[PDB]
Structures are given as structure tokens and as C-alpha cells.
Amino acid sequence: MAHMERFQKVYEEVQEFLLGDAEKRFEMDVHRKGYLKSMMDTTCLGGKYNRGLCVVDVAEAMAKDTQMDAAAMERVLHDACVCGWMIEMLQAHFLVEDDIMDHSKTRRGKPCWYLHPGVTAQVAINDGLILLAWATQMALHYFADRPFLAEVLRVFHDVDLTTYIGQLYDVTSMVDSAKLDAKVAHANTTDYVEYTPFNHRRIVVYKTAYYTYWLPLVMGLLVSGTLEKVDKKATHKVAMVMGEYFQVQDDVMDCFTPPEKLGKIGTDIEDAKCSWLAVTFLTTAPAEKVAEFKANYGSTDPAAVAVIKQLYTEQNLLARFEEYEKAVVAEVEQLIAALEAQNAAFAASVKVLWSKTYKRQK
Amino acid sequence: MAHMERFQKVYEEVQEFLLGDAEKRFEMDVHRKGYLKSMMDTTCLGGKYNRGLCVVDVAEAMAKDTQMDAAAMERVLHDACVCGWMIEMLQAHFLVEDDIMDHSKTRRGKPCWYLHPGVTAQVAINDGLILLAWATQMALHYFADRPFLAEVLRVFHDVDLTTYIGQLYDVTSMVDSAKLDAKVAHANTTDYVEYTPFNHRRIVVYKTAYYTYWLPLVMGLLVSGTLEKVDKKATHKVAMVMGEYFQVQDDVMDCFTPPEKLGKIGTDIEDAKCSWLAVTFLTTAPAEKVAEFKANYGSTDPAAVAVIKQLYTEQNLLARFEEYEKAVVAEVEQLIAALEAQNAAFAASVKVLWSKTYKRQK
Numbered sequence: 010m011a012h013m014e015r016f017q018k019v020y021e022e023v024q025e026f027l028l029g030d031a032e033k034r035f036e037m038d039v040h041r042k043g044y045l046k047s048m049m050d051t052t053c054l055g056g057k058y059n060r061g062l063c064v065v066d067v068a069e070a071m072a073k074d075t076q077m078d079a080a081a082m083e084r085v086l087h088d089a090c091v092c093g094w095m096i097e098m099l100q101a102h103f104l105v106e107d108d109i110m111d112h113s114k115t116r117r118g119k120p121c122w123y124l125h126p127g128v129t130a131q132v133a134i135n136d137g138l139i140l141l142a143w144a145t146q147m148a149l150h151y152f153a154d155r156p157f158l159a160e161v162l163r164v165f166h167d168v169d170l171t172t173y174i175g176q177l178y179d180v181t182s183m184v185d186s187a188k189l190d191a192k193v194a195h196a197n198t199t200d201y202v203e204y205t206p207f208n209h210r211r212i213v214v215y216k217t218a219y220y221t222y223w224l225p226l227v228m229g230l231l232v233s234g235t236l237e238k239v240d241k242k243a244t245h246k247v248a249m250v251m252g253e254y255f256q257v258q259d260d261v262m263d264c265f266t267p268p269e270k271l272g273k274i275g276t277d278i279e280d281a282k283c284s285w286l287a288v289t290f291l292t293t294a295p296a297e298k299v300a301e302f303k304a305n306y307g308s309t310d311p312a313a314v315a316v317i318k319q320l321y322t323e324q325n326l327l328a329r330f331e332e333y334e335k336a337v338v339a340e341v342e343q344l345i346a347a348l349e350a351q352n353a354a355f356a357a358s359v360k361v362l363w364s365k366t367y368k369r370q371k
Numbered sequence: 372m373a374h375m376e377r378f379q380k381v382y383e384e385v386q387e388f389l390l391g392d393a394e395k396r397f398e399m400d401v402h403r404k405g406y407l408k409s410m411m412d413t414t415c416l417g418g419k420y421n422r423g424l425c426v427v428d429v430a431e432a433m434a435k436d437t438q439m440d441a442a443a444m445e446r447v448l449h450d451a452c453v454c455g456w457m458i459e460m461l462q463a464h465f466l467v468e469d470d471i472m473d474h475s476k477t478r479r480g481k482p483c484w485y486l487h488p489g490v491t492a493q494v495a496i497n498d499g500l501i502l503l504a505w506a507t508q509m510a511l512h513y514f515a516d517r518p519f520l521a522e523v524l525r526v527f528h529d530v531d532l533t534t535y536i537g538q539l540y541d542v543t544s545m546v547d548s549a550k551l552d553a554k555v556a557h558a559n560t561t562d563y564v565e566y567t568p569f570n571h572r573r574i575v576v577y578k579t580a581y582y583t584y585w586l587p588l589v590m591g592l593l594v595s596g597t598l599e600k601v602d603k604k605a606t607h608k609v610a611m612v613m614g615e616y617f618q619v620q621d622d623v624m625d626c627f628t629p630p631e632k633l634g635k636i637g638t639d640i641e642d643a644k645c646s647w648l649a650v651t652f653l654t655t656a657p658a659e660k661v662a663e664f665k666a667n668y669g670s671t672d673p674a675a676v677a678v679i680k681q682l683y684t685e686q687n688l689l690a691r692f693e694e695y696e697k698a699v700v701a702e703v704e705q706l707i708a709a710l711e712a713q714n715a716a717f718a719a720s721v722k723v724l725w726s727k728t729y730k731r732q733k
């Protein structure tokens with residue numbers, strides 16, 4: 010991909026800056042500097058970089074569209090790379106903390122950060138907070154003289170909050186919400202009355218769509234000075250449609266994609282997660298199959314988990330996902346066509362992001 | 372306290388705004404809104420409000436020293452209260468995450484948030500992140516048209532990073548730093564070679580002094596538009612001296628103050644923390660007492676803990692603290708006198724903060 014070599018060079022630059030700033034400001038010693046370097050490398054690298062490279066693709070598209078000269082283009086691509094690394098380090102923070110919350114075993118084909126024997130959940134919580142803090146440090150340093158710094162911080166921090174509210178919906182989805190009460194232990198549901206299409210949409214739009222689709226598009230517009238050239242409502246809507254679909258794919262792959270190909274071991278079934286598969290099953294399956302689901306879901310027993318995967322297979326959940334995907338293609342294409350009539354350059358950058366999403370396999 | 376009634380009124384306003392913003396933006400339901408209200412009240416209320424009320428005391432002192440009409444003074448006090456609550460919600464976030472990391476039992480005379488049976492560590496991590504995100508949301512909303520928004524976000528996020536680096540030093544302080552390696556489990560020290568005055572100072576300056584002393588003084592100056600009317604270097608030095616002392620008091624109280632008075636059960640002795648007591652003991656005690664300390668420290672056995680507290684008592688650590696405290700008050704009074712020669716209004720507000728710190732009992 011066109012910007013990978015530039016994006017990787019900016020990673021080395023931003024790492025040297027952040028570790029050097031810690032030596033200057035916090036009397037950082039050689040041993041902890043080395044620990045933080047390995048933490049940054051382990052938590053920030055190894056993913057697909059769809060969020061970071063989107064910022065650069067958008068910023069280049071809009072820089073060409075507005076005919077920026079060689080010096081201005083070089084600045085926009087460098088700024089775009091730094092904003093990309095803000096989102097990648099936000100992702101790194103989110104996955105560190107989520108791997109602790111889900112008690113997960115593998116991430117990007119390596120042990121979860123907290124499961125490194127030299128780490129533990131106790132230290133990893135704080136390592137994940139350093140990652141989050143470092144994302145803002147990059148804006149405050151690299152964009153100190155840029156009029157777009159204010160808007161970069163606003164959209165970044167808004168999406169940061171959004172994602173934690175989605176995570177609140179996610180971690181409370183398997184308990185009766187009327188019984189959500191800090192003073193009283195919460196039994197996992199046995200009736201699954203709240204496993205609804207509305208509740209699934211609300212989890213995935215807030216926990217995933219905002220930081221995965223909306224934030225990279227907006228940051229690429231902000232760094233190129235072109236946010237006012239596009240339809241904000243139309244941009245938001247296509248980000249929500251693609252983001253929901255992206256997390257639906259992630260939900261389908263939890264069950265049906267081998268962990269060795271995905272690079273992680275999902276436990277949506279053993280954790281009774283309100284996944285797209287769980288909701289689509291519960292709302293479409295015959296009564297006797299719903300009963301077998303309730304008797305087996307949310308159990309660590311490998312046979313129980315196999316019963317659930319057999320129920321999903323027998324209810325044609327992969328076929329049902331394919332019909333959902335067809336409806337999403339129709340809607341994304343219509344929204345892109347509407348963007349394209351207003352600003353073709355930005356519409357092309359949404360098509361790039363959509364082509365890396367549609368029918369992905371990991 | 373002059374500003375308590377105004378400060379508690381602004382709490383109720385900020386709470387209504389944040390919960391209402393979540394209903395508006397994130398389709399927040401009545402049950403989770405109730406959960407978040409209970410979480411905010413439990414994690415943000417019940418402390419001494421030293422950080423938040425400092426912001427208002429500094430802002431009022433500096434606004435009175437300027438000539439401005441009643442409407443302008445009302446705006447400075449309201450902004451100061453919001454900035455105070457930013458720091459209180461940052462404190463709330465720090466204590467929620469630290470209580471998970473320390474596996475602690477009590478905070479402000481109630482169970483730790485994560486230990487509420489309807490919460491657990493795996494939900495509380497995310498509740499702690501909501502608190503941190505809400506702090507920035509307050510600035511972005513209330514200070515949307517204020518000239519100091521950018522500099523408020525910069526100092527806030529700088530101190531946010533600083534505290535996590537202090538926390539890194541704190542959580543790694545009991546492992547030989549040459550053996551710090553994410554890949555390899557590492558036994559806690561048996562020789563305590565790194566339990567040095569320098570290493571204690573580095574922990575407490577970054578983990579406590581920046582957010583407890585520096586941040587409230589600087590926010591008070593920013594919201595009143597008077598940061599450039601004071602000596603930034605001298606302000607930093609007095610904040611580092613007072614904040615080191617504040618954390619030394621906290622370390623002494625971990626051992627010597629009844630948990631029912633303190634409102635928390637410290638485990639510095641069980642957890643082998645590099646506390647002021649441990650460093651002062653190891654650098655002053657006779658050789659056989661150092662050996663007995665090493666045989667008993669870092670043990671959950673109540674007999675082992677009782678041996679350490681007896682060794683501390685025998686080495687007169689409370690008297691050694693009184694001598695340190697005499698040296699600190701000599702230094703603070705000199706630094707305040709020097710500030711008073713430059714800006715008497717600001718120096719008075721440093722006296723108010725010091726007066727709440729010096730010889731405190733909790």
C-alpha cells in the first residue's frame with residue numbers, strides 16, 4: 010500500500026520523540042525506556058493499520074484535490090501520518106485494556122500484553138494508559154503551530170469517550186439492565202430478552218464505528234484543511250454503516266474464522282456476548298433451537314461452545330450474513346454516489362476504505 | 372470553606388450536563404444513566420476536594436487582583452469550579468485504576484469501586500476511563516469559546532501522562548530494574564539496592580506532585596488569565612516541594628494512621644513498596660535491623676507486617692518524619708516569601724494550599 014513505507018518511517022520518528030521526551034521530562038532510566046520501547050512495539054504494531062493508513066489516504070486525496078504545492082503536500086502527508094499514529098496508539102490502548110477486561114489469550118498472533126509474564130494485568134492497565142496519553146502527546150508536539158490542533162483534540166477526545174460508552178454497553182449486555190446496580194452482584198441472563206437488534210446496533214456503533222471509520226476520515230479532512238468541502242451528515246452516516254458492518258464481520262469471525270488466521274481467540278460464546286450471531290439466531294430460530302441455545306450459551310465447556318456453533322451453522326447464519334452484506338453494499342454505494350456528486354476526491358477515499366473492509370478475511 | 376457551596380452546586384450542573392450529553396449522543400438508557408450517576412458520585416465525592424478547591428482559591432485571588440466587573444468575576448469563579456471538577460474527575464479516574472492495580476479494599480470509607488459486587492475489576496477499568504474522558508468533555512463544553520481552552524487541554528494531558536510515568540516507577544520499584552523484561556517473570560528484590568532517596572523522590576514527584584500541586588495552581592492561573600503574571604519556574608519548584616511532602620505524609624500514614632481515620636487500608640508493607648518509611652529505614656537503621664527488615668518486608672503474613680511496624684517504631688521513623696517536616700516548612704516559607712515579593716495575590720493562594728497540607732491528619 011502506497012503510504013506504508015512513509016507511515017512506518019513516521020512510527021520510528023514518533024517513537025524516538027516520545028521516549029526521548031520521557032528522558033527529558035521524567036528522568037526516565039535506560040531500563041524503563043527499553044521496557045516502554047518493547048511495550049509500544051508489541052501493542053502498536055502487527056495490526057492491519059486500516060485506521061492509520063486511512064488518515065493518510067484521505068489527506069493525500071484532498072491535498073491533490075486542492076492542488077497543494079510540493080512543500081505543503083509533504084507537510085500534509087507527515088501530519089496525516091502522525092494523526093494515523095494517534096489512532097493506532099488509541100487502538101493499542103483499547104486492545105490492551107479490552108484484552109484485560111475479556112481475559113483473552115492472544116492478540117495479533119502473540120500473547121496479550123498483560124499475559125507477558127514480565128507484565129501482569131496490574132502493570133498492563135497502566136501501560137494501556139501511557140499509550141492513550143502518548144496519542145495526545147503526538148498532537149501537542151507535532152501540531153503545536155497548526156490551527157487544526159484544537160479540532161484534532163476535540164474529535165479525538167469525543168471519540169475516546171464514545172468508545173468507552175460503547176464498551177459500557179458491551180460489558181453490561183449479558184445482565185438484565187433493570188438489575189444493573191453497583192451494590193448487588195449481577196447474574197448473567199437466562200432469558201436473553203435484551204438480545205435485540207437495537208441493543209446490538211447500539212453496542213457496535215459506539216464501541217467500533219466512531220474510532221474505526223468516523224475518526225480516520227475526519228482527521229484526514231482536518232490535517233488537509235478540507236473538512237468544510239464535504240457533507241458532514243453524509244460522511245457521518247457512511248462511517249456508521251461501514252463501522253456497524255465491520256463489527257458484524259468481527260462478530261461472525263469470532264465463531265467461524267480459525268484463531269490462527271484471525272490472530273486472536275474470541276470467547277464471545279463462553280462470555281454470553283450480545284454478538285450479531287446471538288441476536289440474529291435468537292430473533293430467527295425456531296423455539297426448540299432457541300431453548301437449546303439458552304441451555305448451552307455462556308459456558309466455558311468446549312462441548313457447549315460446539316453446540317452453539319452447530320446451532321449457528323444449522324440456522325444458516327453465514328448465508329444470513331451474506332444477505333446483510335448485500336444490503337450494506339447497496340447502502341454504502343448509494344451514500345458514496347451522493348458524496349461523489351459533491352466532492353469526487355473525498356468519495357474516492359471512502360471507496361478505498363470500503364474496499365479494504367468489504368469481504369475482508371481478518 | 373469559602374468556595375465549597377459554589378463548588379458543590381457546579382458538581383450538580385456538570386453531572387446533569389455529562390449524563391444529558393450521553394442521552395443525546397449515545398442513546399443512553401435510563402438504567403445505565405442511573406449506573407453512571409452512582410459511579411460518578413461514588414468515585415468523585417467523599418475526598419477532601421484539596422485539588423478542586425485550590426483551582427477556585429487561586430482563580431478568585433488572581434481575579435480580585437485584576438479590575439473586572441461582577442459578570443466577569445462570576446464567569447472566572449464558574450470556570451474555576453469546572454476546572455476544579457476536571458482535576459477531581461482525573462483524581463477519581465486515578466483512584467479507580469490504582470485501587471484495581473493495588474487490589475485494595477476501601478477508598479474514602481467505602482469499598483473500592485471495582486470491589487462493589489455489581490462492578491468487578493473487568494467493568495471498573497472502563498468506568499475509570501469514562502471518568503478520564505468526562506474530564507476533557509467538561510473543558511470542550513464549558514470552555515468552547517474561552518481563550519485558555521488549548522492551554523487547559525495541554526497542561527491537563529501533560530499531567531495525565533506524567534502521573535502514568537510516576538505509576539510506572541511505582542509499580543516496577545520492587546523489581547531490580549536491570550531484570551525488567553516483559554518476556555520473563557521477575558521475583559521482587561531481596562537486597563533493596565534501588566530503595567534510594569533519589570528513586571523515592573522520582574516516584575512521588577511524577578505520580579503525585581504534578582497532578583496534586585502543580586496542575587491546580589496552573590489551572591487557577593489559566594482560567595483567571597494570569598499565568599504570565601507569576602514566575603513559572605518558582606511556581607513549579609514550590610509545587611514539587613509541597614507535593615513530595617504530601618506523598619511522604621501519605622506514605623507515613625499508610626503505616627501509622629488507623630485505616631478507619633484515613634478511609635483506606637494501605638498495603639505498602641505487604642506489597643514491598645519503595646515508600647518514604649522503607650527508604651528512610653534502609654538508609655539509617657543498623658545492619659541487623661536492615662537484615663530483619665529484608666526477611667519480613669513484602670509479606671502478606673500479619674506477623675511479618677507487625678515486625679516491620681515494630682522495626683519502624685524502634686528506628687523512630689515518626690521523629691525522623693518530624694525533622695524532614697521541619698526542613699520542608701523552612702523551604703516552603705522561603706519559596707512563598709520569594710513569590711510574595713513578585714505576586715502577593717498568587718503567593719497568598721499558595722499559602723492557602725500549604726495551610727491545608729502542613730500537618731494534615733488524613
Ligand SMILES: CCCCc1ccc[n+](CC(P(=O)(O)O)P(=O)(O)O)c1
Nearest residue numbers: 103104106107111172173176216217
Ligand atoms: C476498552 C475500550 C473498548 C475497545 C474495543 C472496541 C471495539 C472492539 N474491541 C475489541 C474486540 P476484539 O478483542 O478485537 O475481538 P471485541 O472484544 O469483540 O469488542 C475493543
Ligand SMILES: CCCCc1ccc[n+](CC(P(=O)(O)O)P(=O)(O)O)c1
Nearest residue numbers: 465468469473534535538578579637
Ligand atoms: C493510575 C495512576 C496512579 C495514580 C496515583 C498517584 C498517587 C497516589 N495514588 C494512590 C495512593 P493511595 O492508594 O491513595 O494510598 P498510592 O497507591 O499510595 O500511590 C495513585
Ligand SMILES: CC(C)CCOP(=O)(O)OP(=O)(O)O
Nearest residue numbers: 055056057058100117217259
Ligand atoms: C474494532 C475491533 C474489531 C478491534 C480490532 O480491530 P482490528 O481488526 O482493526 O485490529 P488490528 O488493529 O489488529 O488490525
Ligand SMILES: CC(C)CCOP(=O)(O)OP(=O)(O)O
Nearest residue numbers: 417418419420462479579621
Ligand atoms: C496522591 C495520593 C496520596 C492519592 C490520594 O489523594 P488524597 O489524599 O488527596 O485523596 P482524596 O481525593 O480522597 O482527598
Ligand SMILES: [Ca+2]
Nearest residue numbers: 107110111179
Ligand atoms: Ca470486549
Ligand SMILES: [Ca+2]
Nearest residue numbers: 107108111113
Ligand atoms: Ca476482546
Ligand SMILES: [Ca+2]
Nearest residue numbers: 259260263275
Ligand atoms: Ca470480537
Ligand SMILES: [Ca+2]
Nearest residue numbers: 469472473541
Ligand atoms: Ca498504588
Ligand SMILES: [Ca+2]
Nearest residue numbers: 469470473475
Ligand atoms: Ca493505592
Ligand SMILES: [Ca+2]
Nearest residue numbers: 621622625637
Ligand atoms: Ca498511599
